[PDB]
Symmetry: C2
Subunit: 244 residues, 2 copies
């Protein structure tokens, strides 16, 4: 029933040359025996070393953010630059960028559309804060965020979209995760179409560990993970193996 | 009289693998016959290729921005990451980040202090908008920006600081540039000390071309350049040679 799972590592703003060499060697030696798309998103300056040292073809390298256009945007990295470098995945709308770096719903929606139209696979992040959840606004918020993205996309774009639900309010039980994933998928099914909804990967982006990954993946509407801190450790392999 | 000049290339969010290979080969073949510190600031994902292909020891590689701390800051690059990668220069406070990416005077001042305390050479950018210049507030603005930076630095930090004046209102005659540079240096001399003021490099960050570089460098308070678009072209070499 489920579509191909994805296990994505978000290294955030972490790593050294030495630590990444060691971690990538562990990922390269891991023999994955089922159909899963693995993604690694290093900090921008580590993308080249990861591209060079990774040899496991079940992985793609992602950026952790991008802007749409090259030009006079000191400090930023654009989608054309990433494409020329051979990066075809990007994480957009991460809660830390929505919170700290001014990415409103509209800003994220436009970036996702720009990444779609430039050929990227996009992990688009959504999720509600503690104040929003306490106000009983979980559904209003995650469906407003998703709707904003959807309004700028044609139906055919959804083959390049992956959603990641971040329970910002926690950063949650597997049951609470499943409730939001099911709501997201039912809204896509109604508004966009049931074929899009059954093929869409909705990844869980709360706290994922070797301890809890299999329990989360048992949920019918969870299609893998956007992993934070545990993705810097050898137990990331156990999180991949939890999607069998 | 003048301190060692600096000619810094800010590539902004521009370049391809192919274009950078070609440009770096031109910079590597250029024989520089006087004492000048050259800097190249590529987009983050191009830092490694530039570090590898550059062979001209008169150049240092810079970042175009950074944050102070590693951690859960998706999409950002930190000063410890850059140091581990061997980057010891950073541009902070560029007008495009102050304008588009929420860097207030306080935010820039704190980053400069954090980069000082982590051992970086810092090109700290200041400059007034068209509305501020029309209000006759050039001096209020560039000295407020500089004062905000200075308030977080001990006197000994100034060996690691370089100022870059950006005439945002234009982006200017060499005379207008010299007036602001002279004002900046006189304020540093009074507030911080005359030995700091005579050793400080104040770089001009308006439109610098092969056509105008020597005329600008003739000005007594201009110590080189933070160059935009012309730094992507072979005529960057002519801008370096204008600091003889
Ligand atoms: As291999
Ligand atoms: As050489």
């Amino acid at each position: 029933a489920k579509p191909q799972p994805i296990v994505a590592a978000n290294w955030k703003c972490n790593g050294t040359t030495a630590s990444i060499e060691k971690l990538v060697q562990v990922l390269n030696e891991h023999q994955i025996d089922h159909d899963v798309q693995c993604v690694v998103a290093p900090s921008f300056v580590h993308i080249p070393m990861v591209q060079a040292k990774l040899c496991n073809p079940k992985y793609a390298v992602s950026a952790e953010n991008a802007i749409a256009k090259s030009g006079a945007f000191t400090g930023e990295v654009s989608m054309p630059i990433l494409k020329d470098l051979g990066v075809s995945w990007v994480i957009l709308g991460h809660s830390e960028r929505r919170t700290y770096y001014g990415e409103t719903d509209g800003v994220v929606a436009q970036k996702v559309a720009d990444a779609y139209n430039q050929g990227f696979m996009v992990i688009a992040c959504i999720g509600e804060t503690l104040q929003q959840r306490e106000a009983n606004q979980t559904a209003k918020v995650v469906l407003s965020q998703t709707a904003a993205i959807a309004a700028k996309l044609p139906k055919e774009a959804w083959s390049q979209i992956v959603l990641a639900y971040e329970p910002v309010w926690a950063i949650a039980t597997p049951e609470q995760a499943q409730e939001v994933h099911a709501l997201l998928r039912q809204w896509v099914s109604e508004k966009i179409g049931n074929g899009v909804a059954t093929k869409l990967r909705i990844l869980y982006g709360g706290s994922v560990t070797a301890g809890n990954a299999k329990t989360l993946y048992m949920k019918p509407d969870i299609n893998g993970f956007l992993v934070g801190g545990a993705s810097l450790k050898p137990e990331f392999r156990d999180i991949i193996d939890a999607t069998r």
